[PDB]
Symmetry: D2
Subunit: 394 residues, 4 copies
């Protein structure tokens, strides 16, 4: 055992790594190009469905490759992120619901557990790609209204929806207003071919350009009541939901560790490929980034193996297993968010001006790595309130 | 009287600041556009020749606006950098030789002091734009230059060819002179940082054989010390944005946000103050030439490198907080805070000196060597 | 022409620097000893009164050495801090009121401007050493109660009072509880020999051991009817100018401890001979940079408080214009100073971990600044963010 | 699973942790006192021999408590360091040879493997306390021996000494030597309560029967002092508990800057424990599960060790500094425990191997060719 994301543990996830080794070269070459143009790798991504990677994190009995170990899921995303961060960010959207649904299928009410099968089995081979329309657009509030006959209409617009260009389904997060007066939080599942559904291609960002992070709108989209994932009212949320949120995006830390590892390999390979005796300041730099890189992988490594031990073991309190997971997660995120772009910055100043050229890969990495600091949960501003609140009373 | 790049001192440089205030708005608007396309501001730049800014740092008796105070030259570049870092980087190339030549004209041999006139007076109105082809391309050793800012609107190139070192001044209209606009770099896209690939013995300005003395360090310092003002400018710029966005949120600011804003404001001040003192120090040592020529070289280059070392980690440090303070909207290529995040990292690659080099230099002065 | 605490500017302060050069050696030798025992330098300090340094920052027409330039006052404390931080911390207490009173004597009401003479002229030669009993003790309130006859009784204790042992007069901050219902804030001046006054020799810290930072209690101290100030709670930003000038010059002593540690560590590294190791060059380059940034920042912050100090023509603006850049410098030196001594420590090696080595003492003396008000990190953050935004 | 030093793994080391829980209170109270005076805890330390902790890291077949898992050895030192860093530093000297000898006893030549059983079995109950005189005094260089060693922790209660002389040999002198004198002149900034004394050797009588470098020796050096990282993680964890307990014990709503501080130190603390945690579990996997190259198992262990050391050396005193500025001036008083911790934490940066200056040449040399 090592705990640094060097190699997967579960034999189920060991099959996902080698199957990916065959698509790595093919996507590592197109990385620079797709980033320049900003075009999602449709054909490079659909090749996953052929192998079955598009269906990992799905029960063996539902399709194949029963991956549930969060630590391995991240070890995979890191191997891929080393090639292209952008595709890795997208593949996560899929692998994400993979775990979300597998938990909804086993521990969910009959009405919602039935539709879980349908989707989980469909993305097993790759016939359906699922996405999540979570965050609302500045000034908008996705909501559900009744029409009269018994059906509902979904209006609103979600932003930052990754992997969207290839998507067949969406997990919209709306909020229906009850006549009682309270506002309930429900998360429908709209098909791509939904009538009011319009996907926009306005994703122009500093990095992660190759991912499909589009804004998607819904205009009076129909959806029978029989297909809603109604939850508890807004506001009064229990810390038990934190376990769900953790498992959802904790594996992304692997991709940032991936970008870092990537930058190092470049900068170190260029510095060693200089020959002779390395300059004084350079030895200090290489020593420093190597250290930060290790601390970085180790931290996210332990944070993962901790979410796994608390995911399928503790059967005591539902709120405790929520903090026990979200906290160390946030500690690792807090670390990677300052420690990852910290090593690429040294790798940058280690290779020199040639690495400032848009043509150089170390330039791209310098933009892709700053993505993590903006991802929820939690932002620095938020993470500080959260972590200090746990360290104290509040 | 503060020393934090607030306002210029010399009345000569106080005239350059207000004359620039009229071109700021026009260029601050096209900043986002020129960066996206990557097109040098030809017409926005030639408007300087019309006012005379293209001729600042040139003796009043040769053309106008006799600016020699390095501290004000930087205060100017900062005001401009707040608008667009790229144009500021370019305008520096011009203002650079401005000081290089004025020193060559007053303290130079008759053969080379005569041609100093011809060029210094020509760029006084803006008839001629001077550039410096210093760094050689990888593999090739002049005997093609890369990283030459403000090349598209050039007229004169001061190449560094060589074993004796000599710098001949070629012209744009030369028979074997080609300028390639193949510049594609992370930040500073709107500058003319392009690459370029006959002359008699009376046009060459021979120099010492190539190893060197410490007196040359004074020249190198005055050449690019004023660029620190542009990075301080980028930082100040990012702050104004991030703080204006945070304050424009209303109500009570979050806990972590107050920590961020307090921190970047601190770093920003340390940053401006340091480059501020490093400048006023190069000016006090620039006017005294009756002492050792090698001492006035270290006394200038050292504090310069301390400020550079500071700004290189402290400037991109404030824009990174300004970035994490505004949120994801600042990650959009459309947002200005995104551009600044790329423009700021330019300084760490500029010679002299790089971190790797600056470390050997600074430790060598702190010890024996 | 510098702005890095290299040399004083005003000719008045140029006289204080060379007069101090003669006492430096004497005190730099006893530094290690007084720190180990924790004994205030009484005789080493009284030698200042002989020369007149104990009376600097006092009008030439009141005693001598008319030092008003805050930048030079700090340049002095840095020269001294390089010898012993502890004595420098104490000498500041005196130099402090020096500026406080000089401003009270020129711009103060007749009742309080008269007693300003009596004290300012007395400490001119060194006949009287003034102190400030500001911060109250945890859970204690220093107030003034009425006895009836007309006099007032002062009870309560103060802590963090440097320069206590040699001290003669105390400027204790107390508050009176009016009958109307609102409480007023007053700063009486009581003489060491006060009837109920007691000074405890209870100081025992990490660093600054040699300073006279003692706790002084006041149990029923009489006093005739006191520098009256406005009611607590509603304090304007104009008071910030006063508070700045009070302890902004201490930044010089921390810059001093840093400069000190460097000289040691670099002198030891250079005295090794041959070729310096890779990591060492990185260290020395780094601390030299931080040291420069450090001196420059506190340098500019000072020259800015001086430019805003002489121009009395908004009283609230001149308060923020001074306190803010001050806090920026403090914020910088508080993380940048102990930052250079830590590299000087890891540059000399284990021998610098020995209590016998001076680099060990400096490592403890430097951490003092982060606890000094105003403002603490916690406080400084609320202050600085409040100025950067609306609030 | 976790790997952050939370709790030991091997059942052998789980018995050392609870046995220590009984001596913790007793030593945690005298910590402040012994530090102020600078007096080694003789009676507090021998109480270990009574229980058997003085004999941990010794084969069950030789005495008892067969602890070989480096990760648990550090988890132990951290539990103890949280009480007093100084005693933990000393107890490490003992536990150190524990692993060094157990490896010498199993994989050593007959002549030296025989004397291994002698000493290993003697310190099993606590009859003999072993020390290491490695470093040599500045200016002097160590049948018939001379020289003088320093930074010898746990000197006072020592009986045997493993000095480092050269012709490179590691003789074994007893405490009752004829030309052996131990000087208790240790006056440091921190870790004053440990037995780090300066011992001299004036022509010592010893028989010859009792007696460039490859990278395989790096494995030995790693296992020797890698477990000390646990004590620094311990000092950090300690300072946090104090500062956070004081901040939370303030009540109401915490100030803005304070929330930033507590969030920051908690993060650094986690990164710190996790890193040294992984570095340990890595030295254990390379310590027993390997029969391959002897030089590879040397770098594979020493490198991640140095990464963790590099991290804890800047990250540990980093959290106590925030805990310091979080509690305020009261924590600057010599009376406050947070003051002591601020001095004890800076010890790690001076310990070999490797120093920052050295660690940089080492780590860059592995990252490149050299």
């Amino acid at each position: 055992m090592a705990a640094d994301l060097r190699a997967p543990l579960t034999p189920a996830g060991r099959t996902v790594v080698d199957l990916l080794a065959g698509v790595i070269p093919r996507i590592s070459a197109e990385a620079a190009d797709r980033d320049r143009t900003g075009t999602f790798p449709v054909e490079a991504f659909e090749q996953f469905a052929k192998l079955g990677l598009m269906g990992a994190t799905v029960p063996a009995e539902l399709g194949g490759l029963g991956l549930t170990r969060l630590y391995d899921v991240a070890t995979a995303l890191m191997r891929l992120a080393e090639a292209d961060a952008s595709t890795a960010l997208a593949w996560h959207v899929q692998l994400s619901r993979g775990l979300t649904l597998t938990y909804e299928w086993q521990h969910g009410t009959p009405p919602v557990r039935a539709m879980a099968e349908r989707l989980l089995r469909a993305m097993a081979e790759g016939e359906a790609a699922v996405c999540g329309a979570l965050k609302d657009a500045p000034g908008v509030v996705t909501e559900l209204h009744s029409d009269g006959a018994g059906g509902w209409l979904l209006s609103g617009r979600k932003v930052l929806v990754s992997m969207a260009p290839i998507a067949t389904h969406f997990f919209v997060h709306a909020q229906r207003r009850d006549d009682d007066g309270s506002v309930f939080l429900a998360v429908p599942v709209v098909h791509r071919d939904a009538p009011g559904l319009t996907v926009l291609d306005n994703w122009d960002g500093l990095g992660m350009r190759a991912s499909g992070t589009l804004e998607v709108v819904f205009d009076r989209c129909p959806v029978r009541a029989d297909e809603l994932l109604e939850r508890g009212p807004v506001g009064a949320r229990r810390d038990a939901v934190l376990a769900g949120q953790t498992v959802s995006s904790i594996t992304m830390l692997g991709i940032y560790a991936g970008i870092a590892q990537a930058a190092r390999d470049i900068a170190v390979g260029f510095c060693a490929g200089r020959g002779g005796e390395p300059r004084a300041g350079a030895r200090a730099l290489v020593a420093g980034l190597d250290t930060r890189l290790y601390a970085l992988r180790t931290t996210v490594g332990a944070a993962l193996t901790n979410a796994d031990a608390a995911s399928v073991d503790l059967s005591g309190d539902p709120d405790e297993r929520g903090r026990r997971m979200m906290t160390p997660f946030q500690y690792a995120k807090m670390t990677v968010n300052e420690l990852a772009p910290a090593v690429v910055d040294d790798c940058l100043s280690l290779v020199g001006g040639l690495a400032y050229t848009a043509g150089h890969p170390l330039s791209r990495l310098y933009r892709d790595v700053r993505a993590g600091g903006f991802m929820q949960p939690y932002s620095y501003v938020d993470a500080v309130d959260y972590l200090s609140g746990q360290a104290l009373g509040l």
